[PDB]
Structure 1
Amino acid sequence: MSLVYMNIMMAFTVSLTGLLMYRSHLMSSLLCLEGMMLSLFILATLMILNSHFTLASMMPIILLVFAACEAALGLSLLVMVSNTYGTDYVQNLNLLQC
């Protein structure tokens, strides 16, 4: 295939390794999640526009809609976490270890 596909999936893999290795900040992992959804959007619309699948042009709008819905859910859960503890550090979520 084309090398633009190489760079798009390579960006997806970068943001996947970013999400799966935490840096003691939940919001940065949320940003990595939005980066992964952006990469999925770009890849999908690239192939859809190249292969002239015209009816599938409505799809990435729906995908980005659900991306933002789950982002809003993540932000609300982060408000609850930051209202319990002092900060948003991911090491404070260790009560369920005993």
Structure 2
Amino acid sequence: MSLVYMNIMMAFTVSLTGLLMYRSHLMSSLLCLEGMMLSLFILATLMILNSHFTLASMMPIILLVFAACEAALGLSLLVMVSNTYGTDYVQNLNLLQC
């Protein structure tokens, strides 16, 4: 297939491995979920604008909506981690190991 899908899928995989390998800091990986949403947006939108399947043009908007509709969720779940502990480090969330 076309050349740009290589790099947009590459950016998805880069953001995937960035999300899936934590650096002990939860906000730095909540950016990686938002980057995966960006890469899925641009990939789906290139496919939809390419093929002129115009009725799915409303699809990435909807996709983008649920992007922040979980990203806000993560931030609402970031502040409860950072109120229990002074930092949002992910290694403070190990109480459920026993």
Task: Supply the RMSD in Å over aligned alpha carbons.
Answer: 0.4
How many aligned positions are there? 98
- Return the TM-score normalized by structure 1: 0.99
Looking at structure 2, the residues matched to 36 and 81 of structure 1 have their Cα atoms a distance apart, in angstroms, of 23
Distance in 1 (CA, whole Å) between partners of 2:31 and 2:51 is 30
Deviations 1:58-90 (A, max 9, x none): 000000000100000000000000000110000
How many angstroms apart in 1 are the aligned matches of 2:79 and 2:28?
14
Unaligned runs of 5+ in 2: none
TM-score computed with the length of structure 2 as normaliser: 0.99
Gaps of 5+ in 1: none
Distance 2:46 2:86 in 1: 43
Cα distance between partner residues in 2 of 1:87 and 1:50: 45
State how far apart, in whole Å, the 2-side matches of 1:67 and 1:30 are: 11
Provide, for residues 6-54 of structure 1, a one-character-per-residue CA deviation record: whole Å limited to 9, x for no partner: 0000000000000010001000100000000000000001010000001
Q: Distance in 2 between matches of 1:30 and 1:71?
A: 7
Runs of 4+ in 1 over 6 A off after TM superposition: none
